[PDB]
Amino acid sequence: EVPIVTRAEWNAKPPNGAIDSMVTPLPRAVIAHTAGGACADDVTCSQHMRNLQNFQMSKQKFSDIGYHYLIGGNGKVYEGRSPSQRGAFAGPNNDGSLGIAFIGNFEERAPNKEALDAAKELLEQAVKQAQLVEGYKLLGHRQVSATKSPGEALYALIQQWPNWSEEML
Protein backbone atom coordinates (compact mmCIF):
# COMPACT_ATOMS: atom_id res chain seq x y z
CA GLU A 1 0.00 0.00 0.00
CA VAL A 2 1.01 3.64 -0.42
CA PRO A 3 -0.55 6.77 1.04
CA ILE A 4 -2.16 9.16 -1.42
CA VAL A 5 -2.09 12.93 -1.02
CA THR A 6 -5.69 13.53 -1.96
CA ARG A 7 -6.83 16.46 -4.04
CA ALA A 8 -8.01 18.28 -0.91
CA GLU A 9 -4.63 17.70 0.77
CA TRP A 10 -2.84 19.53 -2.02
CA ASN A 11 -5.57 22.16 -2.26
CA ALA A 12 -6.49 21.25 -5.82
CA LYS A 13 -9.00 23.22 -7.80
CA PRO A 14 -11.94 21.14 -9.00
CA PRO A 15 -12.15 20.33 -12.69
CA ASN A 16 -13.55 23.05 -14.92
CA GLY A 17 -14.97 21.22 -17.84
CA ALA A 18 -16.51 17.84 -18.42
CA ILE A 19 -14.28 14.85 -18.54
CA ASP A 20 -15.23 11.69 -20.41
CA SER A 21 -15.61 8.51 -18.35
CA MET A 22 -13.49 5.35 -18.51
CA VAL A 23 -14.35 1.81 -17.49
CA THR A 24 -12.19 0.51 -14.60
CA PRO A 25 -10.15 -1.59 -14.09
CA LEU A 26 -8.04 0.06 -16.77
CA PRO A 27 -6.06 -2.13 -19.16
CA ARG A 28 -2.97 0.13 -19.30
CA ALA A 29 -0.71 2.27 -17.14
CA VAL A 30 1.29 5.04 -18.78
CA ILE A 31 4.37 6.56 -17.16
CA ALA A 32 5.14 10.21 -17.86
CA HIS A 33 7.30 12.98 -16.52
CA THR A 34 6.11 16.54 -16.13
CA ALA A 35 9.35 17.72 -17.78
CA GLY A 36 9.62 20.73 -15.47
CA GLY A 37 11.40 21.40 -12.22
CA ALA A 38 11.93 18.72 -9.62
CA CYS A 39 10.57 19.00 -6.12
CA ALA A 40 12.19 17.65 -2.96
CA ASP A 41 9.99 18.57 -0.02
CA ASP A 42 6.31 18.60 0.87
CA VAL A 43 6.00 22.36 0.34
CA THR A 44 7.50 22.48 -3.11
CA CYS A 45 5.88 19.26 -4.34
CA SER A 46 2.46 20.50 -3.27
CA GLN A 47 3.13 23.84 -4.95
CA HIS A 48 4.34 22.14 -8.12
CA MET A 49 1.08 20.19 -8.11
CA ARG A 50 -1.00 23.36 -8.01
CA ASN A 51 1.21 25.06 -10.58
CA LEU A 52 0.90 22.13 -12.96
CA GLN A 53 -2.84 21.94 -12.53
CA ASN A 54 -3.14 25.68 -13.08
CA PHE A 55 -0.87 25.60 -16.14
CA GLN A 56 -2.68 22.68 -17.74
CA MET A 57 -6.12 24.09 -17.02
CA SER A 58 -5.28 27.70 -17.91
CA LYS A 59 -2.71 27.42 -20.72
CA GLN A 60 -3.38 23.95 -22.18
CA LYS A 61 -7.13 24.42 -21.48
CA PHE A 62 -7.52 20.89 -20.02
CA SER A 63 -10.51 20.29 -17.76
CA ASP A 64 -8.16 19.29 -14.92
CA ILE A 65 -4.60 18.25 -14.27
CA GLY A 66 -4.00 15.64 -16.97
CA TYR A 67 -2.86 12.66 -14.91
CA HIS A 68 -4.43 10.27 -12.43
CA TYR A 69 -1.44 10.30 -10.10
CA LEU A 70 1.76 12.32 -9.81
CA ILE A 71 4.86 11.42 -7.87
CA GLY A 72 7.01 14.03 -6.18
CA GLY A 73 10.74 13.81 -5.58
CA ASN A 74 9.75 13.65 -1.91
CA GLY A 75 8.38 10.18 -2.71
CA LYS A 76 4.74 11.19 -2.23
CA VAL A 77 1.92 10.20 -4.56
CA TYR A 78 -0.57 12.98 -5.35
CA GLU A 79 -4.08 12.31 -6.55
CA GLY A 80 -5.12 13.75 -9.92
CA ARG A 81 -8.15 12.70 -11.98
CA SER A 82 -10.22 9.74 -10.86
CA PRO A 83 -9.29 6.49 -12.61
CA SER A 84 -12.85 6.48 -14.03
CA GLN A 85 -12.17 9.82 -15.72
CA ARG A 86 -10.24 9.82 -18.99
CA GLY A 87 -6.83 11.45 -18.69
CA ALA A 88 -5.39 14.17 -20.89
CA PHE A 89 -1.88 13.11 -21.82
CA ALA A 90 -2.13 11.09 -25.05
CA GLY A 91 -4.97 12.37 -27.28
CA PRO A 92 -6.50 9.39 -29.14
CA ASN A 93 -4.52 7.10 -26.82
CA ASN A 94 -5.98 8.47 -23.59
CA ASP A 95 -8.52 5.64 -23.58
CA GLY A 96 -8.20 2.88 -21.00
CA SER A 97 -5.04 4.30 -19.48
CA LEU A 98 -3.98 5.16 -15.97
CA GLY A 99 -1.58 8.11 -16.30
CA ILE A 100 1.14 8.41 -13.68
CA ALA A 101 3.55 11.33 -14.00
CA PHE A 102 6.76 11.77 -12.11
CA ILE A 103 7.24 15.39 -11.18
CA GLY A 104 10.49 16.58 -12.75
CA ASN A 105 12.58 15.98 -15.84
CA PHE A 106 14.12 12.55 -16.14
CA GLU A 107 15.78 12.75 -19.52
CA GLU A 108 19.23 12.57 -18.00
CA ARG A 109 18.87 11.33 -14.47
CA ALA A 110 16.44 8.90 -12.85
CA PRO A 111 13.83 9.91 -10.29
CA ASN A 112 14.75 9.46 -6.61
CA LYS A 113 14.49 5.94 -5.19
CA GLU A 114 11.57 7.03 -2.98
CA ALA A 115 9.67 8.15 -6.07
CA LEU A 116 10.39 4.94 -7.93
CA ASP A 117 9.35 2.87 -4.90
CA ALA A 118 6.17 4.94 -4.64
CA ALA A 119 5.34 4.25 -8.32
CA LYS A 120 5.79 0.48 -7.94
CA GLU A 121 3.71 0.48 -4.76
CA LEU A 122 1.08 2.58 -6.51
CA LEU A 123 0.79 0.14 -9.41
CA GLU A 124 0.35 -2.73 -6.97
CA GLN A 125 -2.26 -0.73 -5.09
CA ALA A 126 -4.10 0.26 -8.25
CA VAL A 127 -4.41 -3.44 -9.17
CA LYS A 128 -5.64 -4.38 -5.68
CA GLN A 129 -8.17 -1.56 -5.77
CA ALA A 130 -9.49 -2.56 -9.23
CA GLN A 131 -8.29 0.70 -10.83
CA LEU A 132 -5.87 -1.22 -13.03
CA VAL A 133 -6.24 -4.73 -14.41
CA GLU A 134 -3.85 -7.32 -13.08
CA GLY A 135 -2.60 -8.21 -16.58
CA TYR A 136 -1.94 -4.56 -17.38
CA LYS A 137 0.22 -3.14 -20.11
CA LEU A 138 2.81 -0.77 -18.73
CA LEU A 139 3.85 1.87 -21.25
CA GLY A 140 6.01 4.95 -21.35
CA HIS A 141 4.33 8.18 -22.39
CA ARG A 142 6.50 8.15 -25.54
CA GLN A 143 4.86 4.89 -26.64
CA VAL A 144 1.43 6.56 -26.77
CA SER A 145 2.24 10.20 -27.57
CA ALA A 146 4.86 12.00 -29.65
CA THR A 147 7.07 13.05 -26.76
CA LYS A 148 10.36 12.30 -25.02
CA SER A 149 8.38 11.82 -21.82
CA PRO A 150 9.05 10.14 -19.36
CA GLY A 151 12.63 11.00 -20.29
CA GLU A 152 15.33 8.61 -21.38
CA ALA A 153 16.53 7.70 -17.89
CA LEU A 154 13.10 7.04 -16.49
CA TYR A 155 11.95 5.25 -19.64
CA ALA A 156 14.94 2.90 -19.39
CA LEU A 157 13.89 2.00 -15.86
CA ILE A 158 10.20 1.41 -16.58
CA GLN A 159 11.09 -0.88 -19.50
CA GLN A 160 12.51 -3.19 -16.85
CA TRP A 161 9.37 -3.23 -14.72
CA PRO A 162 6.80 -6.02 -14.72
CA ASN A 163 4.30 -5.83 -17.57
CA TRP A 164 6.22 -3.36 -19.67
CA SER A 165 5.00 -3.78 -23.25
CA GLU A 166 7.04 -3.00 -26.32
CA GLU A 167 4.04 -1.83 -28.39
CA MET A 168 4.37 1.55 -30.09
CA LEU A 169 1.02 3.18 -30.74
Sheet holding 4-5, edge to edge: 4-5, 77-79, 69-71, 97-102, 26-33, 132-140
Peptide bond into 25 cis (omega under 30): yes
Per the structure, the complete domain to which residue 56 belongs is given by 1-169
Burial letters 90-117, b for 16+ CB under 10 A, else e: beebbbbbbbbbbbbbbeeebbbeebbe
Q: Please give the single-letter amino acid code of residue 3.
A: P
φ, ψ of residue 30 in degrees (nearest 5): -120, 125
Residues 77, 10: Cα–Cα separation, whole Å? 11
Residues 147, 144: Cα–Cα separation, whole Å? 9
- Evaluate whether 144 touches 30 at the Cβ level (below 8 Å): yes
φ, ψ of residue 113 in degrees (nearest 5): -55, -40
DSSP state letters, 100-134: EEESS--SSSPPPHHHHHHHHHHHHHHHHTTSEEE
Give the total number of structural domains in the chain: 1
CATH number of the domain that residue 39 is part of: 3.40.80.10
